[PDB]
């Protein structure tokens, strides 16, 4: 086996899995999801004794059960429910890579509201809502609200987080360190406008977010990682096993 040498021993047989997903979304002003998908990989870190034969199972019949549009594996994987089998390399490696479009969890919903006030002001309210177990925290949230090019200034109020108006980037940026499942937050801004060429209207680009969440928005869950080394005297239960999910936004736009 050219990916794993032959005499590895560890007193503490222990492995680590990372399910890394990036969630993507294009949503219309009327709440319809125009397009959405998730890309993910599973990375494993293993410090197991021998040349063990592991079995990776997750929620894929296709409660909990998810549908994978496609995916590729690491050579060590023996192709042929029917689950994934391999003798992994030692250390850290990319077990599989996958894609997904159905029954995806959109961790965040964004609700924009905008009010034209004569020719001087825009009034904008934006609400974000977290869609997930309240026991879970999202971290590193940013909402990004574009302003027209004739903005002379911006005032905003927001009871959670901080938001700076950023002229170079032509956007209001709201940042929240942590926020829990099933909650709501909002921001209000008033945008003061220079005069402009009446004729060319403003093309409102989407409001966009960045966030990181501790679960796989594809819904994928790890169920088991069975280890078997037949020559040596450690069994599956001897193995300490950890798993952790890091879901993050890719592109996540909402049109107003």
């Amino acid at each position: 086996i050219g990916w794993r040498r032959e005499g590895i021993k560890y007193r503490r047989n222990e492995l680590f899995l990372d399910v890394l997903e990036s969630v993507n979304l294009l949503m219309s002003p009327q709440g319809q999801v125009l397009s959405a998908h998730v890309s993910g990989r599973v990375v494993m870190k293993s410090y197991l004794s021998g040349m063990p034969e592991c079995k990776f199972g997750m929620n894929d019949k296709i409660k909990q059960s998810i549908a994978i549009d496609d995916c590729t594996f690491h050579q060590c994987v023996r192709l042929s429910e029917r689950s994934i089998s391999f003798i992994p390399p030692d250390g850290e490696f990319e077990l599989m890579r996958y894609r997904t479009t159905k029954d995806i969890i959109l961790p965040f919903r964004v609700i924009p509201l905008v009010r034209e006030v004569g020719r001087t002001k825009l009034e904008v309210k934006v609400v974000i809502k977290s869609n997930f177990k309240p026991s879970l925290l999202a971290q590193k949230i940013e909402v990004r609200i574009p302003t027209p090019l004739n903005t002379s200034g911006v005032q905003v109020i927001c009871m959670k987080g901080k938001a700076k108006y950023k002229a170079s980037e032509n956007a209001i940026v709201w940042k929240i360190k942590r926020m829990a499942g099933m909650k709501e937050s909002q921001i209000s801004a008033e945008i003061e406008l220079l005069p402009t060429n009446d004729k060319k209207k403003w093309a409102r680009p989407p409001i966009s977010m960045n966030f990181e969440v501790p679960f796989a928005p594809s819904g994928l869950k790890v169920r088991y990682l069975k280890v078997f080394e037949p020559k040596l005297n450690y069994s599956d239960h001897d193995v300490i096993k950890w798993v952790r999910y890091i879901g993050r936004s890719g592109i996540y736009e909402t049109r107003c």
Binding site: F16, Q139, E212, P214, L225, K241, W242, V243, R244
Partner: peptide
Amino acid sequence: HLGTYGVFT
């Protein structure tokens, strides 16, 4: 913390 490991199994 996001990025924290959970035991399973």
